[PDB]
């Protein structure tokens, strides 16, 4: 009974609730979605539904993708993603060409928001893993942000797999759990979600009903 929608992160603001408390909200433009495809067990081995979101010029879509959209008889969109349902497909509640909007959620509900975190570039150990570094005085020689030891000795004469080191950081797929939907605005089709949502403003975001609630 999972519900899902694709949207765009519009940014953060603040609002006040009935108890006169400030609520930091992230505004998500859960735009209108089209389905374009259903994954059935008998045909693919699992249950899911595709979702198409985002206005795009037909000139910018190549022939294969255009043919895929033509088969389902919908106009091409920018993004395309699948909402993985449970094994109980029920082969219904989703017809090809159906439109989804933001009213599939309600005030006071809980959602799961997944996105792509902002890129951080090549990052050192202190930033990437919270290493303590070394001292800034008392004789320390050029090791103020260096990791220090990375192993033992002749036993063992190697470095183990998965040791924390410096490298590229960010641009990961991240999901945040149990975000309260403060309010859904039906006219402009946005969701006011309390808290922080991964990624940058304008990034694609998928909103799903929380499994744990």
């Amino acid at each position: 009974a999972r519900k899902g929608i694709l949207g765009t992160k519009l940014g953060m603001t603040q609002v006040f609730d009935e108890s006169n408390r400030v609520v930091p909200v992230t505004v998500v433009k859960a735009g209108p979605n089209v389905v374009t495809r259903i994954r059935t067990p008998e045909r693919d081995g699992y249950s899911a539904v595709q979702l198409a979101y985002g206005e795009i010029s037909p000139r910018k879509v190549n022939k294969p993708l255009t043919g895929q959209y033509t088969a389902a008889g919908v106009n091409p969109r920018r993004y395309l993603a699948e909402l993985r349902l449970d094994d109980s497909d029920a082969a219904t509640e989703y017809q090809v060409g159906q439109e989804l909007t933001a009213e599939i959620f309600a005030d006071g509900s809980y959602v799961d928001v997944t996105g792509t975190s902002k890129g951080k570039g090549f990052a050192g150990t202190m930033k990437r893993h919270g290493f303590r570094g070394q001292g800034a005085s008392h004789g320390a020689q050029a090791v103020h942000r260096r990791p220090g030891s990375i192993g033992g000795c002749a036993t063992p004469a190697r470095v183990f797999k998965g040791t924390r080191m410096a490298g590229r950081m960010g641009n990961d797929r991240v999901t945040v759990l149990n975000l309260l939907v403060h309010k859904v605005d039906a006219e402009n089709g946005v969701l006011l979600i309390k808290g922080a949502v991964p990624g940058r403003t304008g990034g694609l975001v998928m909103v799903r009903s929380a499994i744990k609630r």
């Binding site: 603040q14 006040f16 006169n20 408390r21 400030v22």
Partner: protein, 121 residues
């Protein structure tokens, strides 16, 4: 407020300045705000007063230089860090409070201090 911080005593026990020894409320707790309980030592007192220098006491923070958020989105910030020496039952050992105090004492259940204070903000 953390360990080694010094605070001004806001009551009439005779102590002037105390030094924070431990922030109670859990192992390795770092900062004590308004409404938090402190183990402290008396670094200065009025001569021939009730409390002497070097006594280990228990106190509650009532004023902080660092501004503190409130659930409605407002903040409060004082010009000094001040505490009140209390008894094991959370009653102040002194008889009156000097200066204003923060409203978080209400939710921390320090009603006696709240009543004794000249002003609650």
């Amino acid at each position: 407020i953390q360990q080694e911080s010094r605070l001004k005593v806001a009551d009439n026990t005779g102590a002037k300045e105390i030094l924070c020894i431990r922030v109670l409320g859990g192992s390795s707790r770092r900062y004590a705000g308004i409404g938090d309980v402190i183990v402290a030592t008396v670094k200065d007192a009025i001569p021939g007063g009730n409390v002497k220098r070097g006594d280990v006491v228990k106190a509650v923070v009532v004023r902080t230089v660092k501004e503190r958020r409130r659930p409605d989105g407002s903040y409060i910030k004082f010009d000094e860090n001040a505490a009140v020496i209390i008894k094991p039952d959370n009653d102040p050992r002194g008889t009156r409070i000097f200066g204003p105090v923060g409203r978080e004492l209400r939710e921390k259940r320090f009603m006696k201090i709240i009543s004794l204070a000249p002003e609650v903000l």
